[PDB]
Amino acid sequence: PQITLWKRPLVTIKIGGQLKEALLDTGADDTVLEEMNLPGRWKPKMIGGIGGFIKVRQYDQILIEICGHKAIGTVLVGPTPVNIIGRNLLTQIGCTLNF
Amino acid sequence: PQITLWKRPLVTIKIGGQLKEALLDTGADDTVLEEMNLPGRWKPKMIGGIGGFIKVRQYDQILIEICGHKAIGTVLVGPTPVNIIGRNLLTQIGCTLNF
Numbered sequence: 001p002q003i004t005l006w007k008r009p010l011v012t013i014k015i016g017g018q019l020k021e022a023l024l025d026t027g028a029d030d031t032v033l034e035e036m037n038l039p040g041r042w043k044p045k046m047i048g049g050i051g052g053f054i055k056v057r058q059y060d061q062i063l064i065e066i067c068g069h070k071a072i073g074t075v076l077v078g079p080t081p082v083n084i085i086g087r088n089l090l091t092q093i094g095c096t097l098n099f
Numbered sequence: 100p101q102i103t104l105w106k107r108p109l110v111t112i113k114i115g116g117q118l119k120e121a122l123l124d125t126g127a128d129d130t131v132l133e134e135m136n137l138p139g140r141w142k143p144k145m146i147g148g149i150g151g152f153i154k155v156r157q158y159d160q161i162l163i164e165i166c167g168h169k170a171i172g173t174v175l176v177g178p179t180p181v182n183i184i185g186r187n188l189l190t191q192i193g194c195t196l197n198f
């Protein structure tokens with residue numbers, strides 16, 4: 001679809017069998033989700049934005065469905081204020097910016 | 100144009116008569132630029148991100164050209180790690196997400 005930017009570009013995602021709301025974020029290299037208990041091994045990581053860094057758990061090869069479009073990649077999980085879909089998964093669903 | 104997301108969506112902007120590099124960021128409500136000398140009145144403001152809050156100067160009704168498209172709006176100036184163009188100006192240049 002086409003998403004305008006008058007409001008935060010929030011969409012429904014399906015991950016680990018659960019539905020969540022997430023922000024499509026072209027300014028994010030990586031995808032960061034609010035605290036959730038995903039199964040499997042993970043690696044510690046630190047992610048930075050405005051204000052500093054937070055500690056996250058990095059999970060590899062996680063499947064996420066974003067408005068019916070499937071993507072598979074690295075998902076970071078930690079105390080983020082909002083679920084963020086980053087470029088690593090937005091490239092996979094064929095997302096572009098247009099103006 | 101149409102911009103894919105394999106690389107960071109960095110563009111050249113013109114502000115206060117100066118050229119800078121900035122990230123087109125659909126996950127940002129507001130536009131935040133690194134420390135710089137902008138003309139005009141300004142107000143102290145606080146903006147929060149993934150790591151916490153930073154102190155910024157809010158400049159209102161600032162002209163900025165983003166890849167040839169003129170926007171006039173609010174620009175925050177402060178210790179951000181990267182220059183970010185947020186939705187407040189992306190809407191003015193007609194930017195949408197498409198997938």
Ligand SMILES: COC(=O)N[C@H](C(=O)N[C@@H](Cc1ccccc1)[C@@H](O)C[C@H](Cc1ccccc1)NC(=O)O[C@H]1CO[C@H]2OCC[C@H]21)C1CC1
Pocket residue numbers: 025026027028029030031032047048049050081082084086124125126127128129130131146147148149180181183185
């Ligand atoms: C490699 O480094 C990265 O990719 N870092 C990513 C990251 O932080 N990206 C941000 C831009 C960015 C890019 C590189 C370095 C610093 C800043 C932005 O895209 C996402 C962020 C989401 C958000 C956070 C708190 C509350 C609401 C929304 N938005 C934001 O901070 O916006 C500020 C300014 O506008 C205001 O509205 C919303 C909050 C306010 C993190 C996700 C992986």
